[PDB]
Amino acid sequence: NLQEFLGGLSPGVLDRLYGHPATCLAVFRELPSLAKNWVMRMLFLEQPLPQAAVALWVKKEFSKAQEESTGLLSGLRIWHTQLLILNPIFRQNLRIALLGGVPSLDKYAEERWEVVLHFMVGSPSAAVSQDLAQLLSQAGLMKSTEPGEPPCITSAGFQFLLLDTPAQLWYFMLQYLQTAQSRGMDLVEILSFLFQLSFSDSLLNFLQHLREFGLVFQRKRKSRRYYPTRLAINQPGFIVVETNYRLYAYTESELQIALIALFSEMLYRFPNMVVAQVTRESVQQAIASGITAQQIIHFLRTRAHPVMLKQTPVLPPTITDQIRLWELERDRLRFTEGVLYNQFLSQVDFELLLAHARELGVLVFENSAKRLMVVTPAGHSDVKRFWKRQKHSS
Amino acid sequence: KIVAYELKTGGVLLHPIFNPASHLHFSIKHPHTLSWEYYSMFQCKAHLVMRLIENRISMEFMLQVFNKLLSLASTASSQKFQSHMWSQMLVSTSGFLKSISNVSGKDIQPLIKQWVDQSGVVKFYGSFAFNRKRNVLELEIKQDYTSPGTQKYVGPLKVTVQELDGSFNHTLQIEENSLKHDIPCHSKSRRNKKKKIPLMNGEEVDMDLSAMDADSPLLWIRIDPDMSVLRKVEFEQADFMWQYQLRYERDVVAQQESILALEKFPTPASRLALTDILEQEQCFYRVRMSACFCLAKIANSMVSTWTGPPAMKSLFTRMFCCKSCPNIVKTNNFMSFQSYFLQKTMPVAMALLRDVHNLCPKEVLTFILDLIKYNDNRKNKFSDNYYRAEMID
């Protein structure tokens, strides 16, 4: 979430990111319930106040809200104890932010995201863009390994595909920012634009990428002015599920049919409907590709036709249980690197060695009944030395 | 005794050649210049080297050597010629080796050259590792040959490995550049079924295999079990292997060395092992007398963990006191000669118990004083002087 993204930041980047135009307001809206009230209170105070007052300024009931809000805003570093006055820069910017100093667009965003997903899946016809392809490849959801051949889809790719559009886009933009820092694009400048949307060379490239994603559209041969789409700020279902593992989806866009075929066997395709079967073969194929039953169940539930909304639960218990059992049927091997010792002599002496590999992060599996500790070869030169020291101590 | 003396000061040189031994402060050319401790260790090393010659050339051939010497002497002892034949009553080293070579056809000149003419004992440091993939046991035996009393051994070396399929002997060739010796290991199919594990002798016993490793079949290893060299072994087993070697071995020197090596592992499984040795008649009595002192040392080391009464007290009241009165000792009947020795050695080890304050507990001192007060010896056919003297000790 955006709260996680902002919490994972340093004070030096935080105060700079608190730009005058929008950031002080976008981060304010994040404040879930009560911290808004305290920010408004001590927006006009130039004198810090004791912490005991803030502690006792919430009744005994519902105090956990007080502690959680205080911790969240301490992490955000909106104020400092100074002994709880707010940061002067944030106070000034917030005062400046508080009395101081379309139908075609949504369709465009939908179509652009749909073609992006078409390219993501193995669609022969899709929009071509080398920058988009390499960005998706380095986002961790795609791997090519061969420039001549079109890139394939990794295991995480299917999971990302089956996610809903809001979370899908949000995670995609999170990965975009994380890779922006790697490629060298300043994070603060690009981040501030997202906040400003909900109200330079790097800016131009970032806006080009956003337009490729379909969140914005200049509409004037790439002019300075832009008109953000609905997705920039941040529908009825069509699938009918039977009790015999049969799906009737009122789908005209090929994207939905492809998504359904990812985990179902298609039987018929009518102009305004398509018939598929959820069989062991298709479900286990998806599970092997990497999906888990939770994504499939959530996808079918969110794309649930209004006819089956009346029944509770919306998705039949037999179908849900069958999908879950099919996914459980498979349990899979793992991969790690390690080295094992033996002849550990005294018992109380083996317990002290277990804490050496656990603190360094090179321990995989321990055994106090046989004395059997696995150590990765990456930290083999540090565990052996410790063992030698212990032997010397005797 | 001899490895302690030879590592302490130089070494004992049987058969010197005329100084041959300059590492020690007296001359070994005459018996009246020898130190008395050197004379005692000389006789001790001489009879151990004769046991080694019996190990190479069997005991019946050895008794035939001695009978040939005695028979030459007794044919010599009846002549009247003034020493034409009376010098057959005098033995030498060359005559003894020649009589050995006459009766057996083997000469012992490497063994004589190593253990007589050379004046040193050997030190063995062993450690093992079990290779689960190739099912082998990789021993690692290194010698300390740079100490002042030591020498380098290059002969063969017997090792006895007790695995789940039984006890197997292996001969290792320990040349100068040798360090790793790979010996093969057998199955672990006596852990699949509960079957009895066969011992060094022909018998077999039920073992509790819960402490054993799941991947290794081997229960214990003994480097040079028959004491066929003049050696000091320092083997690094795991503590459960020492406990299995204390419980189920049919060799008293291995039970003694496992008692000696269990003092470094104060775990409660070792306390259970020594307590099961102490309760066990049909164990040799000098092993139980050592297990008393080992149990006292282990009990001193695991204070602030010890649960019930002090060590060996409940065991003393179970073995040697009345059934109706626990604190009154039974009247003295010393006719068993093994529970007499164990009874007179158990409070001596029990008095080495110490509390968290480093003072002997007043539960053991009161127990010893009640052993002294309630002592009645008007009924046995044996005297009480050694038992009362051990009570004062």
UniProtKB/Swiss-Prot annotation, chain A:
Keywords: DNA damage, DNA repair, Nucleus, Transcription, Transcription regulation. GO terms for biological process: DNA repair; nucleotide-excision repair; transcription by RNA polymerase II. The keyword Transcription applies. One of its GO terms (cellular component) is transcription factor TFIIH core complex. Component of the 7-subunit TFIIH core complex composed of XPB/ERCC3, XPD/ERCC2, GTF2H1, GTF2H2, GTF2H3, GTF2H4 and GTF2H5, which is active in NER. The core complex associates with the 3-subunit CDK-activating kinase (CAK) module composed of CCNH/cyclin H, CDK7 and MNAT1 to form the 10-subunit holoenzyme (holo-TFIIH) active in transcription. Belongs to the TFB2 family. Component of the general transcription and DNA repair factor IIH (TFIIH) core complex, which is involved in general and transcription-coupled nucleotide excision repair (NER) of damaged DNA and, when complexed to CAK, in RNA transcription by RNA polymerase II. In NER, TFIIH acts by opening DNA around the lesion to allow the excision of the damaged oligonucleotide and its replacement by a new DNA fragment. In transcription, TFIIH has an essential role in transcription initiation. This is General transcription factor IIH subunit 4.
UniProtKB/Swiss-Prot annotation, chain B:
Expressed in all tissues tested. It comes from the Eukaryota. It is found in: Nucleus. PubMed:9418870 was unable to show an association between TAF2 and TFIID. It is linked to Neurodevelopmental disorder with feeding difficulties, thin corpus callosum, and foot deformity: An autosomal recessive disorder characterized by impaired intellectual development, microcephaly, delayed psychomotor development, pyramidal signs, thin corpus callosum, and foot deformity. The TFIID basal transcription factor complex plays a major role in the initiation of RNA polymerase II (Pol II)-dependent transcription. TFIID recognizes and binds promoters with or without a TATA box via its subunit TBP, a TATA-box-binding protein, and promotes assembly of the pre-initiation complex (PIC). The TFIID complex consists of TBP and TBP-associated factors (TAFs), including TAF1, TAF2, TAF3, TAF4, TAF5, TAF6, TAF7, TAF8, TAF9, TAF10, TAF11, TAF12 and TAF13. TAF2 forms a promoter DNA binding subcomplex of TFIID, together with TAF7 and TAF1. Component of the TFIID basal transcription factor complex, composed of TATA-box-binding protein TBP, and a number of TBP-associated factors (TAFs), including TAF1, TAF2, TAF3, TAF4, TAF5, TAF6, TAF7, TAF8, TAF9, TAF10, TAF11, TAF12 and TAF13. Interacts with TAF2C1. Component of the TFTC-HAT complex. Belongs to the TAF2 family. This is Transcription initiation factor TFIID subunit 2. It comes from Homo sapiens (Human). The chain holds residues 401 to 800 of 1199 of the full protein.
